[PDB]
UniProtKB/Swiss-Prot annotation:
Catalyzed reaction equations: Thiol-dependent hydrolysis of ester, thioester, amide, peptide and isopeptide bonds formed by the C-terminal Gly of ubiquitin (a 76-residue protein attached to proteins as an intracellular targeting signal)
Described function: Responsible for the cleavages located at the N-terminus of the replicase polyprotein. Participates together with nsp4 in the assembly of virally-induced cytoplasmic double-membrane vesicles necessary for viral replication. Antagonizes innate immune induction of type I interferon by blocking the phosphorylation, dimerization and subsequent nuclear translocation of host IRF3. Also prevents host NF-kappa-B signaling. In addition, PL-PRO possesses a deubiquitinating/deISGylating activity and processes both 'Lys-48'- and 'Lys-63'-linked polyubiquitin chains from cellular substrates.
Domain Macro: 1-167
Protein name according to UniProt: Papain-like protease nsp3
Length: 167
């Protein structure tokens, strides 16, 4: 039993909700919140901008130190950093950004990072400003993640389309 509320169960291990991941994180304080990161951990917009703003820029400060030490992530890769006031940990995961020309086949690799964590709150990787089809992102998630994932979809209209079209 966990503290997530109001989710629709899609499969054994995947759950979904129309919600703002920032407000959802601030209420559940999950062990792991997933950020829709880029390789530079520059949290400017989209989910990353909203998560970082909610931490009063502490996420960005921590991230800049991480990059200065380790260099950029790989597309499809991840790193674990602090969750600040939102969660115990933040798993920064780099989905391919279609608006940069990155290979959508890397979306599966990106979701594989979730399997290193028993339970996660997450957005749909590569959705929104990363330019991928969210219906495809949800499909890859369901077919790749084996751990317990609670997906937050900010747009109420998009959520209903994902549910009604889910196979
Ligand atoms: C990945 C997309 C399919 C999805 C579209 O809804 N992105 C989000 N999902 C969940 N929560 C989100 N919060 C946001 C805030 N605060 C600012 C900007 C974007 C989001 C967002
Ligand atoms: Cl987003």
């Amino acid at each position: 039993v966990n503290s997530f509320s109001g989710y629709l169960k899609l499969t054994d291990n995947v759950y979904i909700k129309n919600a703002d991941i920032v407000e959802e994180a601030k209420k559940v304080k999950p062990t792991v919140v997933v950020n829709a990161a880029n390789v530079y951990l520059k949290h400017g917009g989209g989910v990353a901008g909203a998560l970082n703003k909610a931490t009063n820029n502490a996420m960005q400060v921590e991230s800049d130190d991480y990059i200065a030490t380790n260099g950029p992530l790989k597309v499809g890769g991840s790193c674990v950093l602090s969750g600040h006031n939102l969660a115990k940990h933040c798993l920064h995961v780099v989905g391919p950004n279609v608006n940069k020309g990155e290979d959508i086949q890397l979306l599966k690799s990106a979701y594989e990072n979730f399997n290193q964590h028993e339970v996660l709150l997450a957005p749909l990787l590569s959705a929104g400003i990363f330019g991928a089809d969210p219906i495809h992102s949800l499909r890859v998630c369901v077919d790749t993640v084996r751990t317990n994932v609670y997906l937050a979809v900010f747009d109420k209209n998009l959520y209903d389309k994902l549910v009604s079209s889910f196979l």
